[PDB]
């Protein structure tokens, strides 16, 4: 189908293209691995927000049960002062929950943008694989054709990169 030096040169070209797409694949697979590790970290962080918030809500439940007695025990004894203190303290607990919640939401928004990044990477990995696979094979067929033609290993070594 061709002559040897022309086949050997094209082997060098196809090999060079193979090494380059192979490196590019490796770049993506690395982003894949990292991004996967990060997403999982964010997911567990979202769980920690949730457990934290849960804790604040038990504190609220505790405040409503426990306080009751002490608001009615202070009303009779004229301590609308002590009652005020408990309720403003309580009001301070509540505003803090809203902050924690606001942070939880920032995270979920970040996890959202990153889940999508993960899918674009996997999509780009998937659009490359065909060429990668095709290049490996074409390269291997040129090596074969040259081996059968009796080309020595030294020549095949120069051409491979």
């Amino acid at each position: 189908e061709d002559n040897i030096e022309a086949v050997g040169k094209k082997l060098h070209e196809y090999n060079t293209q193979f090494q380059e797409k192979s490196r590019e694949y490796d770049r993506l697979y690395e982003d894949y691995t990292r991004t996967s590790q990060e997403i999982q970290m964010k997911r567990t962080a979202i769980e920690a927000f949730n457990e934290t918030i849960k804790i604040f809500e038990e504190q609220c439940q505790t405040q409503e049960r426990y306080s009751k007695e002490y608001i009615e025990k202070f009303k009779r004894e004229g301590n609308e002062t002590e009652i005020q203190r408990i309720m403003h303290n309580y009001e301070k607990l509540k505003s803090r929950i809203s902050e924690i919640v606001d942070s939880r939401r920032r995270l979920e928004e970040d996890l959202k943008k990153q889940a999508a990044e993960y899918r674009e990477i996997d999509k780009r990995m998937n659009s490359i694989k065909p060429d990668l696979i095709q290049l490996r094979k074409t390269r291997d067929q040129y090596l074969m054709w040259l081996t059968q033609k009796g080309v020595r290993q030294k020549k095949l070594n120069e051409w491979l990169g």
């Binding site: 999982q40 457990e51 609220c60 607990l93 998937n126 065909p130 990668l132 696979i133």
Partner: protein, 918 residues
């Protein structure tokens, strides 16, 4: 800055918020809390501070009660700075252990509950209870036992006079006297009194000398004799050791079928079309032909809803049958893209044939050299990124109105049970040393194989037709009366080609004869083989946990091999459950591991700073900045007074900060020097971003070579230093001291360095040390296919021992690697002479005997490497990799032929040596 604003939630419902020092311990913070809470409502209802414990949410998202109030807030590392006061009560011991496990293994226990998986819940209940029971048994056995569990003997693979310095615990004065180089330790003790309630400790180490062996069989002693140094020991009373302890299926001829419903979250080229390929396997063999879907257009959420019917009946499917899918994109029939893949066991962990819908979260396919349709070798665990991974939705149909189970052993042997000389010579031929024709013969003469060739069990297992319940029943019948095989053969049977649980179990039964010394040589491979298991409760797990529980040094290295992969999704669950259980059986060691994890966690941050700084500004300054960072109260404490992870009997005591520095390569590895109250000085390299697994394996093989060598009286003075992966591209390397690189020493220069380190009549020792070690490393590197060997990665000890470092690359990879002799080493071997053939001949001898010893244990290396393929090292992927070693060791050749070819390559390497130098 220092402080951080912390939310406090009091049990009255009251909430306070104020700054505390990041450095303050919880005990201090509790005082500050009380002091501020007296001015807030409802103070008078609180009990005292000691009646309550702080709770936080930790980094692993679990609630933790902070029982140890000497801990600093910055070490506690709460998710948000929120501390809650709760009552003490309700089994504080379980609570504490549970919380520590999560932090230690890097994975919250709650993530196992979250799965709502009975297989997982069953594993933890059985194994944790087993591990706890062993632990409780161990406490009730006396002090000897505790000593053996905790500090097993360090013995050489195996009469001049010997003087030794002995002392007693808590006393300056010491007793130097000559003693029996071959008298059992007791007699040293009995003597020093001028008995049976003592052991001897090696000063400044947790190495102990006891048992019925003689003194020069101990590493410490043996190293002392060779060095010339006087042993230094401490007698320790029993009590002071207690004070450490104390403080139906076969009637279903309907064919196997599945319903392919839908995929989800597929990310493929919208021009192309999508196909699922499905096949059935037992291990790596196909049970029947493959069957494929129709093309459907690419979309995110493609829909097939087709029956796929296989060419095998439900009655024929073996226990370990495995359904394997691959999602592929094809350029619409008018390079197929392999998208992703997933495997599924057809019987569950309790033996029941599965029914119903399954959602398989798939793994992405990697374009590799084999390019097989499907990936039957891959894990049967689903991808745990369930939120974003692609998935397949399939439906196993019903088969009978009751559940069906793979039949019980009894019924397998029910079915399983029930001479030519020409045939008895063809078989012998085949096994003295498969293809279609020979498989039929071996199957026919399987009874003969058992009687006469028990060692060929592996071959017979592969000939057997795992798509035929009759055959399978017959094979298992023999398997159950098969006589016990040697360790070597058992190691073959733990490979992926032998997925049947009867096989695994027969293998482990043969591994139980392993000594702790020998098992330790193989520990790493045995770990990797866990990746080939289908179920969580398996015999190999149980065997590894058994031996971890009986020997603390084994449990130490098992923990680090398992912990170092907790970031890998396909094993995080399995390794995590093993680690949990291991921990519950080793609460003492847990305290050592906890200390090591915080040292390491500090080295990570200390290392990330040094990479980041090094970009900004030059080394001398970054060095001083590294030092300031280190002396911070909390860095310093966490980095000081731990047991080394490389060797838990070594104490890393005081960090010598002004000697701490780092290497100049891209990830800036840290060189950390220590000094303990014993040698006297120890070093470690902390790496973060380099992969160490290639270095570990190579160093483990060099070590195994040293043992096998030493076990035949050949001591080649090797330096197989520690390498321990501990995390995601993180781990430690033992510094070899009083050593330097060839490149440094060169810029008769090697020979002069040696002269200066060994003046006068110790030069002959140095040279002989160099000769022995030069042979060992020459043979090692040749056998393993290690090129890229230069003066930067070859070092020399002041004793004269030469050794290689920082391995990189093996089995030919970036091309057989010739045996290699360096003229500059030949020179030293020859004592500075042009021709010293007496010497040079000895060296060739050493080389030849070493190679000869390794050939005799060649199948051992091959099996060990075969199991390491599970690790996914780029350099040890395939069968040709194993082929490199068969050829390097000339195992296809008689020994005589092997030595003759070695000799030839040896001489060519001698010729070559002069030509490179010119």
């Amino acid at each position: 800055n220092q402080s951080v604003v912390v939310d406090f939630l009091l049990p009255t419902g009251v909430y306070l918020n104020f700054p505390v020092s990041r450095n303050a311990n919880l005990s201090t913070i509790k005082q500050l809390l009380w002091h501020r809470a007296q001015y807030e409502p409802l103070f008078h209802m609180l009990s005292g501070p000691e009646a309550y414990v702080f709770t936080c949410i930790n980094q692993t998202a679990e609630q933790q009660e902070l029982e140890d109030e000497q801990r600093r807030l910055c070490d506690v590392q709460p998710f948000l700075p929120v501390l809650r006061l709760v009552a003490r009560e309700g089994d504080r011991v379980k609570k504490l252990i549970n919380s520590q496990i999560s932090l230690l293994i890097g994975k919250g226990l709650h993530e196992f509950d979250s799965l709502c998986d009975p297989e997982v819940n069953d594993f933890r209940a059985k194994m944790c209870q087993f591990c706890e029971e062993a632990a409780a048994r161990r406490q009730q056995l006396g002090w000897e036992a505790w000593l053996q569990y905790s500090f097993p003997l360090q013995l050489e693979p195996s009469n001049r006079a010997l003087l030794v310095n002995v002392k007693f615990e808590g006393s300056e004065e010491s007793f130097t006297f000559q003693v029996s180089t071959k008298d059992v330790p007791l007699a040293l003790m009995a003597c020093a009194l001028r008995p049976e309630d003592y052991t001897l400790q090696v000063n400044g180490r947790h190495e102990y000398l006891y048992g019925s062996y003689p003194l020069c069989q101990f590493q410490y002693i043996c190293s002392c004799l060779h060095s010339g140094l006087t042993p230094h020991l401490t007698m320790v009373h029993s009590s002071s050791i207690l004070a450490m302890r104390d403080e139906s299926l076969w009637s279903l001829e309907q064919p196997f079928r599945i319903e392919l419903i839908q995929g989800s979250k597929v990310n493929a080229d919208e021009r192309m079309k999508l196909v699922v390929q499905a096949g059935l396997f037992h291990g790596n063999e196909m049970l029947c032909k493959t069957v494929s879907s129709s093309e459907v257009s690419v979309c995110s959420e493609p829909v097939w809803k087709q029956r796929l019917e296989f060419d095998i009946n439900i009655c024929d499917l073996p226990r370990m049958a495995r359904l394997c899918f691959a999602l592929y994109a094809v350029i619409e029939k008018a390079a197929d893209c392999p998208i992703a893949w997933a495997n599924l066991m057809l019987f569950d962990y309790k033996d029941q044939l599965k029914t119903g819908e399954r959602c398989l979260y798939m793994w992405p396919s990697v374009p590799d050299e084999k390019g097989e349709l499907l990936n039957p070798t891959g894990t049967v665990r689903s991808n745990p990124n369930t939120d974003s991974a692609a998935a397949l939705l399939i439906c196993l149909p019903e088969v009978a109105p009751h559940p069906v189970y793979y039949p019980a052993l009894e019924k397998i042997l029910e079915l399983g049970r029930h001479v030519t000389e020409e045939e008895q010579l063809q078989l012998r031929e085949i096994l003295e040393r498969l293809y279609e024709h020979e498989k039929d013969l071996v199957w026919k003469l399987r009874h003969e194989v058992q009687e006469h060739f028990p060692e060929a069990l592996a071959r017979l297992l592969l000939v057997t037709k795992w798509n035929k319940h009759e055959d399978v029943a017959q094979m298992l019948y023999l398997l159950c009366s098969w006589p016990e095989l040697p360790v070597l053969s058992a190691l073959e049977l733990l490979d992926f080609s032998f997925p049947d649980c009867h096989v695994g179990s027969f293998a482990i039964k043969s591994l139980r004869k392993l000594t702790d010394d020998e098992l330790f040589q193989y520990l790493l491979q045995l770990v990797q083989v866990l990746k080939y298991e289908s179920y969580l409760d398996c015999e190999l797990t149980k065997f590894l946990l058994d031996r971890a529980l009986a020997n603390r040094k084994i449990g130490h290295f098992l923990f680090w091999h398992l912990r170092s992969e907790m970031h890998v999704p396909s094993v995080a669950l399995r390794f995590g459950l093993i680690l949990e259980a291991y921990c519950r059986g080793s609460t003492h060691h847990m305290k050592v591991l906890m200390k090591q994890g915080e040292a390491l966690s500090k080295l990570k941050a200390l290392n990330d700073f040094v990479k980041l700084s090094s970009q900004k500004t030059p080394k001398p300054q970054t060095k001083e900045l590294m030092h300031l960072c280190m002396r911070q109260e909390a860095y310093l404490e966490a980095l000081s007074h731990l047991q080394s992870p490389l060797d838990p009997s070594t104490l890393l005591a005081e960090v010598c900060v002004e000697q701490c520095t780092f290497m100049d390569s891209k990830m800036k590895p840290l060189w950390i020097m220590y000094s303990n109250e014993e040698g006297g000085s120890v070093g470690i390299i902390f790496k973060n971003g380099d992969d160490l697994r290639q270095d570990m394996l190579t160093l483990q093989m060099i070590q195994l070579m040293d043992v096998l060598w030493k076990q035949e009286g050949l001591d080649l003075r090797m330096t197989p230093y520690g390498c321990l992966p501990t995390g995601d591209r993180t781990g430690l390397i033992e510094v070899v001291l009083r050593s330097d690189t060839i490149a440094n020493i060169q810029l008769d220069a090697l020979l002069n360095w040696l002269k200066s380190k060994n003046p006068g009549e110790a030069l002959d020792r140095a040279i002989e040390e160099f000769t022995l070690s030069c042979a060992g490393y020459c043979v090692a590197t040749y056998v393993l296919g290690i090129g890229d060997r230069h003066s930067d990665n070859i070092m020399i000890r002041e004793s004269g021992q030469l050794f290689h470092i920082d391995f990189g690359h093996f089995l030919g990879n970036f091309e057989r690697v010739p045996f290699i002799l360096t003229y500059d080493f030949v020179h030293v071997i020859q004592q500075g002479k042009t021709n010293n053939s007496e010497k040079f001949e000895r060296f060739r001898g050493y080389c030849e005997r070493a190679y000869t010893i390794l050939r005799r244990h060649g199948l051992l290396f091959l099996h060990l490497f075969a199991l390491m393929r599970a690790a996914g090292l780029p350099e040890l992927s395939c069968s040709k990799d194993i082929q490199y070693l068969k050829d390097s060791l000339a195992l296809g050749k008689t020994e005589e032929e092997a030595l003759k070819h070695f000799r030839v390559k040896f001489n060519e390497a001698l010729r070559e040596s002069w030509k490179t130098k010119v």
